[PDB]
Subunit: 116 residues, 2 copies
């Protein structure tokens, strides 16, 4: 029952995070594409501050299909030994209609239930 | 009388190239933004193969304002001693709602009158 968040929303690409806990938080990302063309060779990257550790598991695919017909999911495991408020930077890269696109964002809006 | 081209059109950012010649082609770029937020700290970069030479002059500003309320203009002077078909790789970087965005494209649709 940890609230989800929108980690990223710009110009047609949205990424939601959902959370599970059993010092580790397991994040599942869901990437979706509201534009008229597929985002191909899609790669998600994440980094946490040095006082946390992250493990990124394999994504479901490398294509975010046009017009919300499907998603990419991917799991991130975050270790938080010092019990600090979660913080993360993400980087997205993909191809779209002959263009190569990259974007980076800070994710700050983690809910307290995701870490405290 | 040289036809203009759309050098770049993706996801709300459009860049037109217009041309003048008096082996030098003077390109004026026009960047516009049909999205709901300004594209700030906007930087245009261009590269050409080695058998050309480019001089990039200063842009009119560093903001492409939201909802098509204005443009950035910037001049590129290209020298083409071998009179080969003109082509270019461009890279754009900017901030959008705080996210850092980068995009790259090849511009290989130059009109014959821009180089022949």
């Amino acid at each position: 029952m940890i609230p989800s968040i929108t980690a990223y929303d710009a110009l047609g690409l949205k990424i939601e995070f959902t959370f599970e806990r059993s010092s580790v938080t397991v994040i599942t990302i869901q990437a979706s594409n509201s534009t008229e063309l597929d985002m191909t060779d899609f790669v998600f990257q994440a980094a946490v501050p040095k006082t946390f550790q992250l493990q990124l598991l394999s994504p479901s695919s490398s294509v975010v299909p046009a017009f919300n017909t499907g998603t990419i999911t991917q799991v991130i495991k975050v270790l938080n030994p010092q019990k600090q408020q979660l913080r993360m930077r993400i980087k997205l890269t993909f191809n779209w209609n002959g263009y190569k696109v990259q974007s980076e964002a800070e994710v700050n809006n983690f809910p307290p239930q995701s870490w405290q």
